[PDB]
Amino acid sequence: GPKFPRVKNWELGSITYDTLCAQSQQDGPCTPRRCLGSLMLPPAEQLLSQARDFINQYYSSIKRSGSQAHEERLQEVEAEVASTGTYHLRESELVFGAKQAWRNAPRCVGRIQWGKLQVFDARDCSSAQEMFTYICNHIKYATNRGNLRSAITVFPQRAPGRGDFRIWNSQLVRYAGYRQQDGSVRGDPANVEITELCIQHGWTPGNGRFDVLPLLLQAPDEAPELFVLPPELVLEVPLEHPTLEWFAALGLRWYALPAVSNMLLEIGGLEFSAAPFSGWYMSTEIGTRDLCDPHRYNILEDVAVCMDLDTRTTSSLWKDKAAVEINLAVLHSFQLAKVTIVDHHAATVSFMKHLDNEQKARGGCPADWAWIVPPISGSLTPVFHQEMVNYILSPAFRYQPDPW
């Protein structure tokens, strides 16, 4: 009967309909002919309608839709575009749009926390040193000595024919990737290019598997300036296993604060090219993807050898065994170091709770199944059995071209 997508949970046998998708004003990659769900990467009038939509969302969200303060703000926005081509957000509109952006992000399993985000307004920032300061305050606040708090620092928006504010690094904390003159990679192979870029702008490079990179920060129309994070601010966790005593001797570690810095925050048309945000990790990001991907640290074989497994064949399930212990080592060490982390079971459960809230509040929740299901123990988590609708709402986070 209802002509909205029917959404089923195959474990519990329950059924919903996503009506929220009707609100989507941007096309994704799929068509009736073929599904492109698994791919990672798929102006006056145009700006004004995006701005009107957002202001409408704002007033809705405080329950004053249609009111004269709503029609006045609408008027104020169109007046400001009329004469300058852009406009600006009130403080509390930025706070709402930034949260709304996290809320709308289809690939984030952490959304249950969407309403608990600290928004640092940094639209006054006018230099690269100042960005540094702002970022340090961020890390300091967000890190909070282990008791991690979600936050986002918002720098000034794209302006017409004026350079963007850009953080070159893809995350605020990143280990160096040193290309060897024997093809291989020392450190994190994900970070090869940014390392090369830092060195070229005059960083004296280290030599280790876990060297914290400096920040490359770009004020409008200036070459990027290089900034070393003072070590005492970058909280790391040494990794050790609860029962395998030799795991500590591997000298593996990860940093506490996952802070993404290369995304664009789009709110009602306006684009914030430098709006770094952070939360806390899910255990599989480090334990499974970062440490075990063949194209990352790739420690799987090393660990299984230590665990004395048969690596000559697949049917020993040697990879599955080691993956689990590496993950268990991530959880145990973070717990021991009193640093916030969430395991993939706890995390997905809370995402199911989120789906139920959003069903009630908005009529659905855009979700990307391939990304919400964790990279180990998929069907062991309730999300695997949950059909999901994926679509682009706004405000949003967006990828953007690398500044170089």
- Which residues have a catalytic role annotated? 108, 111, 280, 285
Window contacting ligand HEM (CB under 6 A); options: 58-66, 157-165, 276-284, 377-385 = 276-284
Which two tokens mark 236?
């790391």
365 contributes a contact to ligand HEM by CB under 6 A: no
Report the nearest approach of ligand XFH to the CB of residue 295 (Å).
Answer: 13
Count of residues making up the chain: 404
> From CA 9, how far away is CA 77, in angstroms rounded?
43
Strands 177-179 and 259-260: unpaired
Among 61, 384, 400, 403, binds a copy of itself (CB under 8 A): 384
Q: Which of 347, 353, 351, 355 minimizes the C-alpha distance to 331?
A: 347
- Comparing every residue's Cβ against ligand H4B, the nearest one is 371
- Of 25 and 38, CB closest to ligand H4B: 38
Q: List residues binding ligand H4B (CB under 6 A).
A: 10, 38, 40, 370-371, 384-387
Among 342, 373, 383, 389, binds ligand HEM (CB under 6 A): 342
Query: Which of positions 276-295 make contact with a copy of itself (CB under 8 A)?
Result: 288-289, 292-295
The string of DSSP letters for 69-138 reads HHHHHHHHHHHHHHHHS-----HHHHHHHHHHHHHH-TT-TTGGGTT--EEEE-TT--SHHHHHHHHHHH
Q: Which does 387 bind (CB under 5 to 8 A by kind): ligand HEM, ligand H4B, Zn ion, none?
A: ligand H4B
Helix axes 91-104, 44-61, angle to 10 degrees: 90
Q: Which does 37 bind (CB under 5 to 8 A by kind): Zn ion, ligand HEM, ligand XFH, none?
A: Zn ion
Query: Which of positions 308-347 make contact with a copy of itself (CB under 8 A)?
Result: 314-317, 319-321, 323-324, 327-328, 331, 335, 343, 345-346
Among 87, 134, 254, 277, binds ligand HEM (CB under 6 A): 277
37 contributes a contact to Zn ion by CB under 5 A: yes
Residues 170 and 198: beta-carbon distance below 8 Å: no
Residues 359 and 111: beta-carbon distance below 8 Å: no
Among 61, 113, 311, 359, binds ligand HEM (CB under 6 A): 113
Q: Which does 262 bind (CB under 5 to 8 A by kind): ligand HEM, ligand H4B, ligand XFH, none?
A: ligand XFH
Positive or negative, the CA dihedral 296, 302, 308, 310 is: positive
370 contributes a contact to Zn ion by CB under 5 A: no
- Of 12 and 36, CB closest to Zn ion: 36
5 contributes a contact to Zn ion by CB under 5 A: no
> From CA 222, how far away is CA 403, in angstroms rounded?
12
Among 17, 19, 24, 30, binds Zn ion (CB under 5 A): 30
- Of 16 and 153, CB closest to ligand H4B: 16
Residues 37 and 30: beta-carbon distance below 8 Å: yes
**242 contact partners, CB below 8 Å, separation of at least 6:** 328, 329, 332
152 contributes a contact to ligand HEM by CB under 6 A: yes
108 contributes a contact to ligand HEM by CB under 6 A: yes
Report the nearest approach of ligand H4B to the CB of residue 107 (Å).
Answer: 6
Q: Which does 17 bind (CB under 5 to 8 A by kind): ligand HEM, Zn ion, a copy of itself, none?
A: none
55 contributes a contact to a copy of itself by CB under 8 A: no
Which two tokens mark 291?
């440490």
- Amino acid identity for residue 336 in this structure: L
Window contacting ligand XFH (CB under 6 A); options: 114-122, 259-267, 375-383, 386-394 = 259-267
Residues 39 and 29: beta-carbon distance below 8 Å: yes
> From CA 55, how far away is CA 64, in angstroms rounded?
11
> From CA 399, how far away is CA 330, in angstroms rounded?
28
Among 262, 273, 288, 386, binds ligand XFH (CB under 6 A): 262
Integer CA distances (angstroms), 367 to 21, 111, 150, in order? 11, 10, 21
For residue 361, the surrounding DSSP H or E stretch is helix 344-362
Per CB under 6 A, residues contacting ligand HEM are: 102, 105, 107-110, 113, 117, 150, 152, 277, 279-280, 282, 285, 342, 347, 371, 397
